[PDB]
Each structure stands twice: as structure tokens, then as C-alpha cells.
Symmetry: C2
Subunit: 209 residues, 2 copies
């Protein structure tokens, strides 16, 4: 499903953040040493991450721009959100994504009480209209913030309407065809690093007695 | 800041989550190559990751699902409980409040804090919203371990500083900005864009290598 490996792809946004910070701090260059350091990735694997895409170290602005194009952030994307509950509205109001080029075009819900209300001047619309909406609107990415009840069916509707990327916040295993990109968000992967770190001292004490 | 490297620590929840799914499907065993293929991590690195934490009655090759799963639960400190508070009672804070009872196995939410006088007394998930001006006292009185930040960037660093001086041990930060805390305080920045930007990457990959 990808050309470059997913483990490589997932370190790329991290390189981008750090390079974006250096670039704000008008830093001109950085060694592989300094970077292989802050990423805790082998100065080799960094160099090898990048060699997938083609010194005095790295020029900052050059590497940042290159990372931007590699990540497809030199284009804009039309998004819609399915589910107008707290998580859906949280994501609609997460304006850093907009700033990065992901333009929210519509929000969809099953509950008629919400129809026609607006969140950041985006209208909440009946999900039963979403296929019609998607045809006439060139939508790139569907974002799923709904319960499990009709999740698979809803994903399949988006796909039938020609959506080729789903960003899914529901912790369940959706199936999409091989030509559709599905990215599942797993918040516990982050939270459980916090329990790990809080417990680490105790764990080693118990193990190493 | 840690005994084990962060690159290792961040793979551990991925192993736990994949094993959980197998355990739910009553898959008894999983081979090293099957595990590696699923994780995108070499079998040897996976052996090395686990070996940080001792043996766990492994036998021959591959793994017993239930035992590996239970080992990972222990390693991730998921046999303990942690007292949490959320700062921010808007949509994000309520969604995280909802998520962390689907994780309240372990993460016990004690209070929600907000700057809006209006909300002082609401409930959420049977949890009172309280004035953020009381949070320092609350942390010390209720042995709070983890402060979860779901507020705007506006007074975020100031909010993080208050939790720190009240003795907080970790901060789980949902704001798209990297906060400053003392080296002894655990700070975990959620970077949702790190996930989103992989979808832009994959929508353009074939182009990128056709371009190139």
C-alpha cells in the first residue's frame, strides 16, 4: 500500500516539527549529530530516512521545505467531519489543521436537532446527504468522529462516493479497499507512555530484586 | 529522563494494542515473524525491546498471546491506577473525559477545571467542573498524578506552571504547542498532526516518486 515504509513515514512529521522550530529560531544549519540526537534516531537512520527521497550538516530552510513537499503540505485538502458530538466539534475547532492547509467543508450528523447550526461558519448537515455533498464538493479526506453503531456503513458510503482518505478517531477496525487510505488515531499509544514513565522506577525496583 | 529509550517506550503500547486484539479473538499464539510483519519492527528489535524487562515464561519460538499481553500491561504500569484532572471543559476536554473512562480502567478522573464562572458546578461523567483558580489546592489534596491540558494556547504555559508548582507529576498536553516543564515532570505532547500528515503523505506518494 505504500512505497516508503510506514515506520519511515511516521518519523517524517516529527522531523518537520523540529525543522519548523529551528526555522522560526532563524537557525541556518544543523549537523546530523545534533539532529540524530534530538530525534533519538540513528544519525544513520535519519540520513537513511531522507535518502529515501534524495554536507555542512543540513541547511534548515532547504530540509524544511523538502519535508513540507514530501508530506504533501504544499497542497490544500478539503475535509469533512462525520459526527458533531464533543470530539467532532473539538476537531472542527482544532484550527492548527486549517492553518496547515486542511480546509473543513462540512460537518455531518444524524441528529435533526443540529441541522443548519454552524461551527466556525461550517454548517452541520444531515449525514444522509453526505454522498450528494461529496460529489459536488471535491472532498479529499473524511474524518470520522462517530460511535461504532453505523461506522462501517458510514465508511463504506464515503468510499462509494469516491473518498480516498479516512482519518478515523473511533477505536475500531474499519475495512476500506486497498486504494483508500485509512489512518486510525490511537490516543492510548500516547497515554500509556505516561503510565510507563510514572511506573518505570517501581517496575525496575520490582524486577531487579 | 528514562531508564529505557523513548523509541523503545513508544513501541510498547503498539505491541500491547495488537496483542489485545489477538487476545480478544482468542488467538493463542503468535510467531515472531507474524508479530514483526504486523508491527513493522524486526523480530530481533522486538526481542530486544522485551528483554529490557526480564523473561516472562517464554518457550520455543514466538509468543503466548495472553502471557505477552499481560507482561506488556505490567510493563506499561497499567496494573496501577493514576488520579487525573482535566483542565478545559470545552468540547476537547469533554471528549477526553469520555475517552478516559473507556480508559478509566486505570485513569481515574477526579475533577475538571475551567476559567468560565458559568460552569462552576456542572457535571460531566458525574465529575464536577470547578474553578481553575482552585486547582493547585485540589492537586495537593487529592494526590493528582496527571494533569491533562485541553485549554486554548492563551494561558497554557501559565496553566502548566501552576500544575507543576502544585506538585503534578505528569502533563498530557493536547495543545498544538510544546510546553516547558522541569526535567523531572513527565510531559507528553499529543501531536495529532503527526497522524494527519501521514494521510497527506500517502495521498501524494505516487506522484512524489513519479515526479522525483
Amino acid at each position: 500500500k505504500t512505497i516508503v515504509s510506514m515506520a519511515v513515514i511516521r518519523r517524517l512529521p516529527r522531523y518537520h516539527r523540529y525543522l519548523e522550530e529551528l526555522l522560526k529560531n532563524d537557525v541556518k544549519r544543523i549537523s546530523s549529530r545534533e539532529l540524530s540526537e534530538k530525534m533519538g534516531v540513528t544519525a544513520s537512520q535519519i540520513r537513511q530516512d531522507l535518502n529515501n527521497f534524495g554536507g555542512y550538516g543540513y541547511n534548515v530552510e532547504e530540509l524544511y521545505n523538502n519535508l513540507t513537499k514530501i508530506l504533501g503540505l504544499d497542497k490544500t485538502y478539503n475535509t469533512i467531519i462525520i459526527g458533531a458530538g464533543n470530539l467532532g466539534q473539538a476537531i472542527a475547532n482544532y484550527t492548527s489543521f486549517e492553518k496547515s492547509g486542511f480546509n473543513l467543508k462540512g460537518i455531518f450528523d444524524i441528529n435533526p436537532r443540529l441541522f443548519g447550526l454552524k461551527i466556525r461558519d461550517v454548517e452541520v448537515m444531515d449525514v444522509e446527504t453526505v454522498e450528494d455533498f461529496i460529489a459536488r464538493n471535491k472532498i479529499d479526506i473524511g474524518i470520522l468522529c462517530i460511535p461504532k453503531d453505523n461506522a462501517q456503513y458510514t465508511a463504506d458510503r464515503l468510499v462509494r462516493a469516491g473518498i480516498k482518505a479516512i482519518w478515523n478517531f473511533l477505536p475500531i477496525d474499519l475495512k476500506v479497499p486497498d486504494d483508500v487510505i485509512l489512518e486510525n488515531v490511537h490516543l492510548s499509544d500516547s497515554l500509556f507512555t505516561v503510565s510507563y514513565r510514572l511506573n518505570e522506577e517501581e517496575l525496575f525496583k520490582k524486577l531487579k530484586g
